[PDB]
RNA sequence: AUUGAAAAAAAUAAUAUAUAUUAUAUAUAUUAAUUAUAAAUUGAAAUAUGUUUAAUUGA
RNA sequence: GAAAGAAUUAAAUUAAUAUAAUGGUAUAACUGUGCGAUAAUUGUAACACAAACGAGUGAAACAAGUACGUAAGUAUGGCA
RNA sequence: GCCCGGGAGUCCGGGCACCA
């Protein structure tokens with residue numbers, strides 16, 4: 001069987017999505033401003049283990 | 053959120069445990085070198101606790117006491 | 125007449141769009157909103173291109 | 189020159205570091221380059237000296253019942269630069285006798301003022317917002333700070349901020365209190381009690397909640413400088429209800445653990461009181477009623493709050509408790 | 521740290537570095553910056569290098 | 580006896596509310612300001628009011644993420 | 660909404676879809 005158009009273009013789509021995800025936070029930061037970015041960076045640095 | 057960040061947390065915990073074990077081993081080795089009597093495991097644990105206390109803000113005697121009390 | 129509709133596409137390429145209305149002059153809109161496919165907030169950007177009522181870039185660097 | 193003298197006046201009123209004192213009287217910024225860079229304001233010396241002379245004179249003039257006397261002393265001292273330096277730039281929590289004596293009245297006053305400025309206010313806010321006061325004990329009037337700590341479990345060092353979320357691990361073993369008294373009270377004869385209550389445990393019969401007393405100390409002796417309530421001090425005779433840890437059931441909200449500190453009623457020596465340790469029902473416990481019975485006056489309080497987590501089962505097991513109930517996620 | 525002036529340390533907070541814990545803690549050090557941001561032949565200032573004069577100083 | 584602070588009482592009200600009229604509003608919804616452009620987000624919405632049906636209205640709670648907030652919390656566009 | 664005629668912008672007149 002040949003496979004449906006949507007079924008063959010699935011892997012590629014997934015890959016694209018993944019790529020987007022990888023480069024989304026940065027985009028958001030850009031949209032926001034520098035202060036937001038700085039804050040995010042600070043948060044990342046923080047070093048604080050939670051609990052479950 | 054918990055589900056997401058649970059595996060990571062677990063990993064971290066494991067790492068910490070490993071580190072602790074290593075420290076304990078080191079302490080044991082030191083003790084051996086010194087030549088002191090030892091129960092030995094317990095002693096090592098106590099030592100580790102004391103060290104931890106020291107690392108955090110505690111007067112040394114007080115820290116030791118605290119460690120002892122935990123065990124008790 | 126004044127208010128046109130526009131389609132905002134998720135910057136994460138899940139193909140989840142959302143629509144809003146704006147004035148014809150309105151600046152190039154973006155907004156971060158929840159994308160149910162990716163299940164997290166993402167920037168949504170205008171899909172179709174459209175002319176914008178140009179505003180002068182305000183000068184912070186004391187020119188002339 | 190009364191502030192120069194140290195016969196009757198305690199030694200704590202001076203700056204213990206000599207260099208600093210010297211600098212003051214005619215600096216600290218450690219780095220040499222930084223020091224070089226620094227440039228103080230002109231004519232500070234002579235004017236400062238004059239000011240000192242003035243204030244010293246005032247103090248001398250001031251210098252001459254107990255509370256009144258204490259107040260007078262405080263008034264005399266406060267403007268001393270040295271004392272100010274000591275108080276401002278040295279830690280008040282883990283106090284060091286010679287730098288800041290809370291035996292000395294001025295220092296005590298300063299501490300009180302500091303507390304009023306921030307920590308006390310914070311505590312009050314936490315009490316009000318979280319509905320600690322009206323829910324457990326009608327009201328309080330701050331009087332003394334109460335800082336808790338959980339040193340034994342885990343092993344780390346941290347003073348708990350009021351109204352925090354503590355992990356079940358952290359609150360697995362008992363806490364340590366530091367009841368920092370002020371207000372010219374007796375030290376030999378005055379005893380204290382401390383009660384850790386949690387008012388929100390699920391009552392299924394009524395469908396409401398009931399208040400459990402998870403930890404209870406009575407007849408504790410305190411001192412202005414020596415106020416850490418460690419197992420060293422209290423002994424097993426003073427515990428009315430031995431420590432039980434927070435073990436919130438799943439989906440039973442956020443349980444508020446609110447530590448209350450009361451001072452005993454005062455009648456020669458230290459007046460004790462029996463409290464029928466066996467008879468007193470701890471599983472369900474009336475705080476107000478208890479207070480009425482023994483005529484306590486709640487001086488100070490602190491609070492934290494616990495939630496369910498994976499760790500609590502283990503804690504329960506350790507303590508040898510039931511497996512713990514589980515509640516529906518819906519507030520039906 | 522080297523230049524100036526003439527043993528150490530004991531707050532808060534900020535920053536740098538480390539580590540403790542299914543605890544955004546602690547230990548050590550130091551207290552920066554506080555209205556700034558591209559593009560100016562003639563505006564002004566400073567420094568370095570020459571010449572002159574009352575080894576140097578001023579100009 | 581003075582200074583300063585915290586205020587409290589009285590008056591609050593037709594000013595203001597994106598917009599008619601009404602009801603509300605100083606405990607401010609009205610005004611100023613910091614941060615923020617995020618709740619003018621995403622699945623389930625019980626139950627009410629209203630209601631012939633088609634429709635409409637308020638909305639607890641569950642779950643996913645976001646903003647501000649020391650915290651309590653607050654935000655599913657606009658005082659109605 | 661798209662295409663003309665009088666680099667961008669405004670202001671006017673033609674068409675071309677939409678017309679359930």
Ligand SMILES: [Mg+2]
Nearest residue numbers: 593601602603
């Ligand atoms: Mg009106």
Ligand SMILES: [Mg+2]
Nearest residue numbers: 596608657658
């Ligand atoms: Mg509003």
Ligand SMILES: [Mg+2]
Nearest residue numbers: 629630632634
């Ligand atoms: Mg109906």
